[PDB]
Amino acid sequence: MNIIAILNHMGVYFKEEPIRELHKALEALDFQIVYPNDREDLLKLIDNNARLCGVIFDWDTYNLDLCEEISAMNEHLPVYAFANTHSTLDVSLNDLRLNVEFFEYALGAAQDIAQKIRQSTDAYIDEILPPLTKALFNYVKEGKYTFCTPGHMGGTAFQKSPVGSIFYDFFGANAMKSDISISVGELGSLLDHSGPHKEAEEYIARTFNAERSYMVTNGTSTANKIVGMYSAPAGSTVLIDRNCHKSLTHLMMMSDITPIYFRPTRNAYGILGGIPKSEFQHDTIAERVAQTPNATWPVHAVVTNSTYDGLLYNTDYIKEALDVKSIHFDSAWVPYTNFSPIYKGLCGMSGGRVEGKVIYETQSTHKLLAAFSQASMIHVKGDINEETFNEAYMMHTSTSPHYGIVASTETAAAMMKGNAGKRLINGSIERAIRFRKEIKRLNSESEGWFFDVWQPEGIDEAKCWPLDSKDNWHGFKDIDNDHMYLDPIKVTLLTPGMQKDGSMADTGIPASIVSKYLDEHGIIVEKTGPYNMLFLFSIGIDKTKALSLLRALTDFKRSYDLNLRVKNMLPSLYREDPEFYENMRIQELAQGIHALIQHHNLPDLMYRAFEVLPTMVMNPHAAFQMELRGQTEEVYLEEMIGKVNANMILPYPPGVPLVMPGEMLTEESRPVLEFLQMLCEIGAHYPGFETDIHGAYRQADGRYTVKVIK
Amino acid sequence: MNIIAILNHMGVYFKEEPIRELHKALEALDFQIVYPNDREDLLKLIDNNARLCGVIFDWDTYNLDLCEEISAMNEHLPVYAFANTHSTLDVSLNDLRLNVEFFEYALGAAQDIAQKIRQSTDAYIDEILPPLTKALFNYVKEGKYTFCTPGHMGGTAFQKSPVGSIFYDFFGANAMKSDISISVGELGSLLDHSGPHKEAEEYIARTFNAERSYMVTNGTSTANKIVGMYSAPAGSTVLIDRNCHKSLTHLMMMSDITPIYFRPTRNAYGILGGIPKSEFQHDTIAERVAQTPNATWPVHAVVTNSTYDGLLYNTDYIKEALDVKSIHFDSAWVPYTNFSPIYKGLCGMSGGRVEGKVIYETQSTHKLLAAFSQASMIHVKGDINEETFNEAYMMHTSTSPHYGIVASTETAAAMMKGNAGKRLINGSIERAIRFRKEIKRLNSESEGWFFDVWQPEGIDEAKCWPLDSKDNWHGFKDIDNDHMYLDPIKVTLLTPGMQKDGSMADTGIPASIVSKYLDEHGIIVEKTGPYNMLFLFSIGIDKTKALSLLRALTDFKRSYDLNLRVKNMLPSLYREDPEFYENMRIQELAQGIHALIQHHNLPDLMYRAFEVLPTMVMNPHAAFQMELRGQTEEVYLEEMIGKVNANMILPYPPGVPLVMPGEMLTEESRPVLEFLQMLCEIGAHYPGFETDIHGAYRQADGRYTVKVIK
Amino acid sequence: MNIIAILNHMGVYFKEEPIRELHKALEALDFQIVYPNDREDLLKLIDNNARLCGVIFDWDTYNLDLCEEISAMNEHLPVYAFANTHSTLDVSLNDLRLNVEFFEYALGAAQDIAQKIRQSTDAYIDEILPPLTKALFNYVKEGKYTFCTPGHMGGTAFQKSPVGSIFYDFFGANAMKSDISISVGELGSLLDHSGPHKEAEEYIARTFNAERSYMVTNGTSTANKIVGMYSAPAGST
Ligand SMILES: Cc1ncc(COP(=O)(O)O)c(/C=N/N[C@H](CCCCN)C(=O)O)c1O
Ligand SMILES: Cc1ncc(COP(=O)(O)O)c(/C=N/N[C@H](CCCCN)C(=O)O)c1O
Ligand SMILES: Cc1ncc(COP(=O)(O)O)c(/C=N/N[C@H](CCCCN)C(=O)O)c1O
């Protein structure tokens, strides 16, 4: 934050000489001087380099509208205008609102002006920094000696060891000096909500449209556990999205609560759909309560918004129709809502208080914003017991929080403020839309197969595209209108292999092969389905990465059409089993995997298996408790009918839980067993594509076992 | 790790010129060349700089015993010997065991030798690095493009923002690039225990003398909860150290487990003593089970070893005598055991398998070793159900672990390997002992008051000093012999105010004032008691910090004797309340606090309050569940007698839980109430010394309230 | 107050190279480094140059009695001892009374030691400065814009005039920037005996063995008139 831009190269000594003296004086204050050639050059320089901390220009040459253009991108960016002919009568109120400091041309005045510019730079840094992060930076500047934990003592222990010195050099001195504990009392305490930490929370609460905000250092898994534990005492009933993360299952296995599951939809690709509106109706909930033993009217409800693939709910309807006092939205995938108007009414915090209800949002700051991993936010709108919620929060938060993660959470809040943050979010949205349009365009010019994007046909402007019943791009059957919206940030690319009606095509390219190819060429997809790939076009994706992705996809298509050897096209896959892939070509491998999927009819089997709910003999807490007591045995896959499952069965695809602890497979739920057996059979044919079923254990004979209650 | 030391100043061109050529060629490979003046200079240089990666010396001038001296400090540090007169007949087997590579003198041979030295440096780095950290570093060197979480995409989003650019510049590019998720499949999965992660675990298990090892990214709080949840099913009885961390209390509030509390001792200073051997006897436990309602024979037992003040147990006796199938040692404060012989038999992992028992150790790697905060280890010795334990582990571990914390854990394991790690631990122990001896010496030669050190009178050699019933330095009454030992690392300094018999002196200086003075002068103590101050002499403490501490203590004594103004001595304290501290001098403030402590008789009241156990109406789980249901009201301090506490009451001092959730104060436990009232009265007299009682809430009127069940 | 004396010419790399690095890091912080040839040279240099703000020496070569000799001339002058063989057991209470800060020899540790020495230099300057003078210097460092008397506004009016510019160059910028009035409320008021002014009086009273002290800006003529007028009412002898 030490780059100062000086405009103009005028030809009068009485201006150039003071500017050269000021250049020397600023360099004496550790500033880096850059010289844009014109106004447009300066604007581009500001737009591309966030470390530009100041602009110096001649007022005689440029009017104060240049400051308006500068403030359109960064309203806090200090501007220094040198006045020669204009006086105090040449400035208006609107101009006086801009962040301009006025200086004059004079020999020998460079030291004072350089000091003024230094003070202005410090003030700008102070203004844009959030409170807790600024306090942490100041503490690191202090350089105090610690005799407390962590114990590496600001990295000294690492510097005393060779391997530790490598670690120190990799992570740097500042990452070690900022690693502190509550023994440093000037920083306050995360658990006590005191000092800068306290202000941090309020800062966050104002940035994310929340009444109360809590910082979590063990991810949205821990955030979900905290919210669920405060909301649902032992013996209560909770509505749970079936498309819930495994953390909700862990919470259920932790606390004795009775679950009643919302039933979401899906398509042929295996993309999880939204919960139909009827499932939020009071009569449906009452019927499920009556049909569920030891179940009363639910006191908490958890909905996944959005889904992994980017399907957001109209949350106003849910907040109005869900007759539950506590509504929690697992928004791990959408922390950027409230920073763009396209998400209005599509998130838990949207709007104001709900009478007689409390609304929670759990957000993975580290997922779609800029924050270190495990950084999570809990946002509360409504009435809570602050003491009791603080107890539930302390039971899951460590007494030695990582200050880097907490500061990253606060800095993520800070990065969303002002014109710079608005431009960040809007630019990411526009980049994703441009990539989607380019994928469609390339598909049009392509002669033969090419990747498609799972989206509406004619996307034009920046918005969350609604999923209507008339259209068939989304693949959902009889969908509710004004219910589900597609997030433009989450870009799903489709590989060939499925038809418009949901059936399989004669040929197809499993998306896992494309994922491996991208990995070999330095591109990491977020996740891969049977014929879909998810790419996150977050604030961290630039034009370079999008163009590289396009080039890699085109190169894959060219290589596949040429039918190259798997040895050369996928070197890592060949290294997995050189004998099996010695002479195989990419087309033969892709067609073999597609033929396995088609002959076993994976899409229909997966859909049928996930549209029938296994019967709940006991809640997950009871099954886990009897598992901890040793009352469990390992049986084979085919013998699981009539057995109470002890663990969660989470297969890939589709990547969501199919069987919950305390659930039993019957003749009605036999599709679950045959889908699992199909997955086990398919995963044993190609050495680089194994069966991935959490909760199932592969034996030496290749058979798969599950753990069930005796 | 690019510093090469050349020990050579010969006066022959046929050696000098090839060495100069080698210097230029090594500099071309980005090596920093240093020139020690002699053998002793080279040895000191190696001892003081862990970034030295190679030694080049002339074999004619120096025999191979110099390599022996080098390997005494670093057995992997490559040595390059230039042979002129010696041949293959001049090397013995013992010399051949040393890591020495032989070269020859020749013009024009510098490039090949420099390449060989580069390969040797890379081999050295590879040899000392642990596997998972090496994989992380290699992945960062790859520089791939991510379309997955975290979403800052290696820090790109940070570089696109001004405040984010400040954050990026502070933490550095490598910290942000190493932040990844399981979408990068080559690094494996911590949750799945696959790939390099798996190797890391095995590596850790071999370094810490554990059968199995698990890495926790949410601290020893989460590690304790995982161990307890696996070991204690709902409805089971657990033996719990009363000197337990709040995490064990949180686990009891989470799971319906019935606790039976061990009773540790304490001294006049409030230092928590060890649990007497009688509490571990089968008859005592059986009697407690008979008296405790809804209690069976305990299936789990948790012991805090060591204590906060550094008291380790003879763990062999506990393992032999404690008739519990599951014994868990909360060793958050002692992760360096197994790395020094003085701790033999003083930790859970010491020795081998206990027949019919499982032993757990929970270590805060980030507390006394070199690791990032929240890094913890679970060490298991004995038979466990790996699948059930893995489920319990997943229930508390986030699906997006901080890879930096995981790598810091592995690097902490690697830092203990070899002669360098042995020298690190031994140097820390010897530094702590030298500081203790210096404190004793300064006390002996001081005229008047001086800081004391809680230790035996005649500490000479490096060992854990036993606490004998004959000596009275430790202040414990009728202690068992060969039971408790003092860890030399944990240095407790005593300020005047107490007497040798346990009563308080006429005058005294509370340790909080000394703590504030040290904070003002850049020294952070671990924690402060009424008259004691704890300092951690970890591997991160050097001679510089120890001498700085001594200087600061002498400065405090001088300033206090001069009776300076509080305005000048403690500027922050005066800034808290300028009107109250306007004319106060340090002696008056210290004497006022000491007079309050004496008049209220804090030591005797605290001892009595922690000597009587409050009666357990219900276990903490029941109280917390009924608190989550709104069945809790708020009463004042004087009205808690006969009420069931809803939350744990943790007073400071002594910093350990006094009242647990579900416990009720009676006439037998009225000293608890008197002690709490005394603390509330004492904390309202000086604006910088407030009452610190977790679970008690100060109101506007100044009175303190606690909440109980209605 | 930026002259640091470094005292040794040892013949070992593991000490010489860190000292050279510290020399570079101290020059980066605007310090002037001097190299006395021996102990007596250093003592004479300290005696003859009050602008010496620090002494760096090797603890192996010189015991802490050299710090005693230095403190005999200036008890607040910071000394920096580099410890190699001596440990915490080699220092006594009397030595611990001296204003010595201890460092170690290590490559790459120069920036931290330079920052520590800078903080020590600032503390030394603060300790020797009186309160009101310190406040005036700090205010001048703030560089505020005044719309109040004196009216030259920190010397701007002098810089706007040729003869005024000669006057300004002669008297210097700090003299004109420190010439302020009570409109700057943070400096307090001499007439009201408030703020740093009040502290100044107390400071003066302690230094001159007086119960009360008053500052006069019009000489002992005015001081005598004040004392006499308070002491001698009209009509007295
Ligand atoms: C809806 C929802 N709610 C909560 C959480 C827990 O949040 P976390 O602890 O991870 O911060 C997640 C986490 N999903 N990601 C993990 C894998 C890590 C990311 C790999 N690129 C998974 O797929 O299991 C979630 O999807
Ligand atoms: C016996 C025992 N067992 C487990 C834990 C949890 O380990 P953690 O989650 O913190 O890694 C702790 C934690 N003690 N330290 C914390 C914070 C200290 C910060 C200043 N140095 C506290 O005082 O409450 C413990 O003392
Ligand atoms: C006993 C006594 N009491 C008070 C004062 C007034 O003090 P002042 O206003 O000057 O600060 C003076 C002043 N004497 N100085 C002048 C000579 C000027 C300096 C020549 N080098 C004189 O002799 O006339 C004094 O001698």
Side-chain angles (χ1 to χ4, degrees), chain A residues 241 243 263-266 271-280 303-318 329 334 342-347 454 456 463-469 471 473-488:
Chain A
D241 187 354
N243 194 45
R263 325 273 315 252
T265 61
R266 56 206 69 234
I271 293 159
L272 262 280
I275 300 156
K277 299 169 58 117
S278 57
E279 301 254 324
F280 297 102
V303 181
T304 297
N305 174 76
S306 57
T307 71
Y308 206 157
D309 304 286
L311 289 189
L312 296 141
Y313 293 85
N314 171 55
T315 53
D316 299 315
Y317 169 78
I318 299 175
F329 286 105
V334 277
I342 71 166
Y343 306 106
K344 209 297 301 176
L346 304 182
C347 56
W454 183 68
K463 90 216 287 288
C464 295
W465 305 291
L467 276 69
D468 182 282
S469 44
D471 309 358
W473 68 265
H474 41 77
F476 300 114
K477 182 68 158 52
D478 316 335
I479 201 149
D480 278 300
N481 274 22
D482 305 312
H483 188 44
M484 313 299 309
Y485 301 77
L486 175 56
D487 195 317

Side-chain angles (χ1 to χ4, degrees), chain A residues 45-57:
Chain A
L45 186 54
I46 288 165
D47 189 60
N48 284 346
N49 305 271
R51 276 166 56 248
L52 191 279
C53 72
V55 183
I56 296 166
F57 77 98

Side-chain angles (χ1 to χ4, degrees), chain B residues 47-62:
Chain B
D47 196 55
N48 286 339
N49 301 271
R51 269 167 62 248
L52 210 153
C53 65
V55 181
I56 283 158
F57 79 98
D58 184 65
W59 194 3
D60 278 353
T61 305
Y62 304 103

Side-chain angles (χ1 to χ4, degrees), chain A residues 144-145 150-151 234 366 373 538 625, chain B residues 150-151 179 234 366 519 522 526 538 625:
Chain A
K144 289 185 173 197
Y145 287 154
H366 70 81
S373 290
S538 72
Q625 285 317 310
Chain B
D179 190 23
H366 68 81
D519 197 351
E526 168 48 56
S538 78
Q625 287 312 311

